[PDB]
């Protein structure tokens, strides 16, 4: 039972932070990148290296202690940080043609963010059920061929940063009543990134009943993926490249029964 919003100067708070991308970080110089992408010969032999696998980002943000009142998330401003880095087409890249600049970051992207009053709820789905996910990651267990389309056994919480690979988990549309999530997968090997920035855009997080995510235990959960595409090295080897995401959330106190 959601009751009235509290008013007064004391009745609002805001959270501001950024989430770093978790692309794999294959050495001490390659934060924000994955390891070079290799191709297994068969579905059966697919055994991706941990450093080759982008993972979901998550932060649990403690809010001011309330107690029954709960913090309600009302608005979000969000932004991908560092979009102009993609203008570095002069570093270790592959010339597009003789004497040309380096091919820029392009290809498959996944841009995703969520705000909730509890951990994002995940459903596991795998491209290839015979993929062996590596030690150090949290992945769909006991996968069967049905896991390639929908296996309801694969339920998890996004409760650990740099652990849940992007490719084998999505938000669970059968749950997540207390989260708002948004994402876009743009495929193709050459697809161009299109990255917009502005400080004038706000997303309202209220549902159809005028209620936003309610923060259980006075914690706010923010999640993100910003795989921007792949960087191609001079040899032609490709690595995922990601960027950080800014969040600013405005919250208000709501009485509940």
Chain residues that interact with K ion, rule: CB under 5 A: 47, 130, 132
Using the rule CB under 8 A, is 158 a contact of a copy of itself?
A: no
CA dist 158 and 221 (Å) reads 9
Instruction: Answer yes or no whether residue 123 interacts with a copy of itself by CB under 8 A.
Output: yes
Structure tokens at 6: 């509290």
Of the candidates 4, 65, 135, 194, which one interacts with a copy of itself according to CB under 8 A?
A: 194
**How many CB atoms are closer than 10 A to CB 148?**
15
User: N- to C-terminal Cα distance for the chain?
Assistant: 5
What are the two backbone dihedrals, phi and then psi, of residue 194, each rounded to the nearest 5 degrees?
A: -130, 110
φ and ψ of 146, to 5 deg: -65, -20
List the structure tokens of 225.
């993926």
Instruction: Give which of 134, 103, 47, 144 is closest to 238, Cα–Cα.
Output: 103
Give the binding-site size for a copy of itself (rule: CB under 8 A): 116
> To the nearest whole angstrom, how small is the minimum distance from the Cβ of residue 106 to a copy of itself?
5
Q: Which is nearer to a copy of itself, 71 or 250 (CB)?
A: 250
Closer to a copy of itself by CB, 65 or 84: give it. Answer: 84
CB of 8 to a copy of itself, least distance (A): 18
Nearest distance, CB of residue 144 and K ion, angstroms: 14
- Report what 95 binds from K ion, a copy of itself, none; CB cut-off 5-8 Å by kind: a copy of itself
Nearer CB in complex with a copy of itself: 156/168: 168
């Amino acid at each position: 039972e959601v009751l009235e919003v509290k008013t007064g100067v004391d009745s609002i708070t805001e959270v501001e932070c950024f989430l770093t991308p978790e692309m794999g970080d294959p050495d001490e110089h390659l934060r924000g990148f994955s390891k070079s992408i290799s191709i297994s010969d068969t579905f059966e032999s697919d055994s991706p290296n941990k450093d080759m696998l982008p993972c979901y980002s998550v932060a649990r943000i403690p809010l001011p202690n309330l107690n029954i009142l709960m913090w309600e998330a009302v608005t979000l401003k969000t932004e991908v940080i560092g979009v102009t880095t993609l203008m570095n087409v002069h570093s270790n890249g592959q010339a597009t043609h003789d004497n040309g600049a380096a091919k820029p970051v392009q290809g498959t992207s996944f841009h995703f963010f969520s705000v909730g009053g509890e951990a994002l709820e995940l459903q596991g789905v795998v491209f290839n059920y015979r993929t062996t996910y590596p030690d150090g990651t949290i992945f769909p267990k006991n996968a069967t061929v049905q896991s390639q389309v929908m296996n309801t056994e694969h339920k998890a919480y996004l409760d650990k940063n740099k652990a849940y690979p992007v490719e084998c988990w999505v938000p669970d549309p059968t749950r997540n009543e207390n989260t708002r999530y948004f994402g876009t997968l743009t495929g193709g090997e050459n697809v161009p990134p299109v990255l917009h920035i502005t400080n004038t855009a706000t997303t309202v997080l209220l549902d159809e009943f005028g209620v936003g995510p309610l923060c259980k235990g006075d914690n706010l959960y923010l999640s993100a993926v910003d795989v921007c595409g792949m960087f191609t090295n001079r040899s032609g080897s490709q690595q995922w490249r990601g960027l950080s995401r800014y969040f600013k959330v405005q919250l208000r106190k709501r009485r509940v029964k």
